[PDB]
Amino acid sequence: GLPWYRVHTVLINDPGRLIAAHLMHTALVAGWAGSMALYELATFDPSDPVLNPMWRQ
Amino acid sequence: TLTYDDIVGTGLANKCPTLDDTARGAYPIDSSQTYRIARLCLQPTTFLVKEEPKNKRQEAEFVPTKLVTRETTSLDQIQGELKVNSDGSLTFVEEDGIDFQPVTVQMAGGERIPLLFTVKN
Numbered sequence A: 001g002l003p004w005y006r007v008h009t010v011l012i013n014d015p016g017r018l019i020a021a022h023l024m025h026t027a028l029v030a031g032w033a034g035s036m037a038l039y040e041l042a043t044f045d046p047s048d049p050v051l052n053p054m055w056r057q
Numbered sequence B: 001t002l003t004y005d006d007i008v009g010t011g012l013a014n015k016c017p018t019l020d021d022t023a024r025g026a027y028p029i030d031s032s033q034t035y036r037i038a039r040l041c042l043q044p045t046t047f048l049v050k051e052e053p054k055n056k057r058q059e060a061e062f063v064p065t066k067l068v069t070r071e072t073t074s075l076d077q078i079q080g081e082l083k084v085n086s087d088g089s090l091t092f093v094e095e096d097g098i099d100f101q102p103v104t105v106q107m108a109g110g111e112r113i114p115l116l117f118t119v120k121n
């Protein structure tokens, strides 16, 4: 069988499933962006742009 | 002029009576006579709250807030004596009325500030 480090090679000859895998990847990345923003908003203190700006937090 | 059923649910019941643009006259005070305020109404249109900076060296500002307790804010049906003093100044002395309203406003960022909006005594 395919060794573990080669499992994704089943997509080489399969354009449709490659698009599917790419779509899943894109979904994970956009989901991360959304999650990260929400986590940041849950933690961010907006009360002092002078001495406690975003980059200190 | 207007009845309860004309007014109910509109928001007008939280508003004070207004006067015409033409009402710019003068009401004479006779120092021989005693006076009263038969009705005093107060309708808040803005609630501002002073910012409390960590840097107690900057000049702190009063900032706009968002009202969350709806049209429940006005003081009304307030009465008391209107004394005429020696120097001809008038002194209103609040005696009774709907002279307080609990009010909650919200700062930018969501912090709620309850207050007893009042003119008691």
Ligand code: CLA
Pocket (backbone or CB within 6 Å): A004, A005, A006, A007, A008, A009
């Ligand atoms: C666009 C980027 C990209 C894409 C689409 C691919 C795609 C592919 N790679 Mg290449 N490769 C890349 C970049 C990429 N690679 C980089 C940056 C390196 C150096 C690190 C390599 C080094 C490399 C080697 C040595 C091999 C491949 C192989 C393969 C093929 C099979 C992969 C597989 O089944 O893994 C299966 C993987 C797993 C089951 C688990 C991997 C777990 C990793 C190590 C840790 C977790 C990572 C985490 C989940 C993702 C983090 C995201 C990150 C970008 C921030 C496939 C064509 C194989 C091949 O050529 O087959 C014939 C192969 O031997 N790649």
Ligand code: CLA
Pocket (backbone or CB within 6 Å): A002, A007, A008, A010, A011, A020, A021, A022, A024, A025, A028
């Ligand atoms: C972008 C991510 C991505 C995508 C689109 C694919 C897509 C594909 N994979 Mg690959 N894989 C991935 C990442 C991905 N994989 C990673 C990170 C690993 C190492 C675990 C693998 C290991 C792997 C194997 C062994 C196989 C595939 C296979 C396949 C195919 C069928 C689906 C499958 O069997 O998945 C299996 C993989 C998973 C179900 C991913 C594991 C889920 C991990 C643990 C993340 C858990 C998410 C969770 C919600 C977060 C945890 C939070 C934590 C803080 C508690 C398809 C082409 C199959 C294939 O066709 O072989 C020929 C197959 O046998 N993958």
Ligand code: CLA
Pocket (backbone or CB within 6 Å): A015, A018, A019, A022, A023, A026
């Ligand atoms: C007018 C024709 C056209 C258009 C507009 C595109 C556009 C795109 N292609 Mg390409 N492609 C084309 C022709 C076209 N292609 C042809 C003729 C082939 C040979 C079959 C390919 C082969 C190909 C492959 C193998 C892949 C792409 C991928 C992509 C996407 C990469 C960027 C992305 O995912 O952003 C992020 C997405 C968005 C911001 C959302 C965009 C909104 C979409 C377009 C609306 C979806 C509804 C629509 C009616 C259905 C799909 C339309 C389709 C023509 C793209 C992008 C949407 C990649 C992809 O799909 O990755 C996920 C990919 O793997 N294309």
Ligand code: CLA
Pocket (backbone or CB within 6 Å): A008, A025, A028, A029, A032
């Ligand atoms: C330009 C930006 C970019 C590029 C080129 C890639 C490219 C890739 N991504 Mg994606 N990713 C990105 C941004 C990007 N990512 C962002 C912003 C997020 C949100 C955080 C993700 C989330 C994400 C997930 C969840 C997964 C990928 C995976 C993949 C791989 C899929 C192809 C494959 O089979 O590789 C085969 C694998 C390799 C060639 C190994 C990659 C080696 C990386 C670069 C270093 C890993 C470091 C270390 C060993 C492990 C980390 C420690 C651990 C505790 C997490 C490929 C390397 C999938 C994957 O790796 O499947 C196996 C996968 O599951 N990505």
Ligand code: CLA
Pocket (backbone or CB within 6 Å): A026, A027, A029, A030, A032, A033, A034, A036, A037
């Ligand atoms: C649908 C449209 C769309 C829009 C309007 C946005 C908007 C935004 N995103 Mg989101 N995102 C989207 C889709 C979108 N995204 C998709 C489909 C994914 C999954 C891949 C993501 C994943 C994502 C992540 C992980 C992040 C964002 C972030 C952001 C913000 C900053 C953008 C930035 O810095 O870009 C930077 C973009 C570039 C520098 C473009 C690079 C272009 C390269 C160089 C092109 C190279 C190839 C090209 C073909 C070369 C030829 C060019 C030719 C003209 C000559 C912004 C609010 C950030 C954020 O703030 O999250 C909350 C952030 O971290 N997005």
Ligand SMILES: CCCCCCCCCCCCCCCC(=O)OC[C@H](COP(=O)(O)OC[C@@H](O)CO)OC(=O)CCCCCCCCCCCCCCC
Pocket (backbone or CB within 6 Å): A002, A003, A004, A005
């Ligand atoms: C964010 C989500 C994250 C997802 C989690 C991802 C999980 C994937 C983890 C990958 C684990 C890979 C391990 C494969 C391990 C493995 O299968 O090895 C053996 C393997 C042999 O492959 P073959 O081609 O012979 O095929 C046999 C097949 O059955 C394998 O599938 O070779 C490799 O994979 C190359 C990598 C070398 C690695 C060898 C290092 C071992 C040395 C020991 C190091 C410690 C000693 C140090 C002392 C100083």
Ligand SMILES: CCCCCCCS[C@@H]1O[C@H](CO)[C@@H](O)[C@H](O)[C@H]1O
Pocket (backbone or CB within 6 Å): A041, A042, B109, B110, B111
């Ligand atoms: C999917 C996004 C929906 C989540 C929206 C959350 C409301 S918005 C949220 O409100 C808080 C209190 O006012 C603020 O402290 C915080 O900065 C703000 O992000």
